[PDB]
Design a protein around this ligand. Structure first.
Ligand SMILES: *[C@@H]1O[C@H](CO)[C@@H](O)[C@H](O)[C@H]1NC(C)=O
Lengths: 48, 49
């Protein structure tokens, strides 16, 4: 987020994240309207 | 944003695997209590002795 991108349509860039404290409440200011679709995990309780 | 509709539909499909086929559940609850019984099993009585 808030960064440049590469033409990864054919070769998606993968970022491995580990050993950190994750917050999702800051991801709600991406744009005036955006999709936050989730499959397998409810949108809530993600922090817990 | 943080506004949700609680109702979601299953959309059952026969092509789904074992874990997605619909199942019908009937839950029977009894209450064994000192109060007089209305419903009883199919048993035959006997003369009082
Ligand atoms: C991303 O950038 C926008 C505009 O520069 C800003 O409003 C928003 O807070 C930023 N988000 C993050 C996570 O830095």
């Amino acid at each position: 987020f808030n960064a440049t991108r590469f033409a990864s349509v054919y070769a998606w860039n993968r970022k491995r994240i580990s050993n950190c404290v994750a917050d999702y409440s800051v991801l709600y200011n991406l744009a005036p309207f955006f999709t936050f679709k989730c499959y397998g995990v409810s949108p809530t309780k993600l922090n817990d | 944003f943080n506004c949700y509709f609680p109702l979601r539909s299953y959309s059952f499909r026969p092509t789904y695997g074992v874990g997605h086929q619909p199942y019908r559940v009937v839950v029977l609850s009894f209450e064994l209590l000192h109060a007089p019984a209305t419903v009883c099993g199919p048993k035959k009585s006997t003369n009082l002795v």
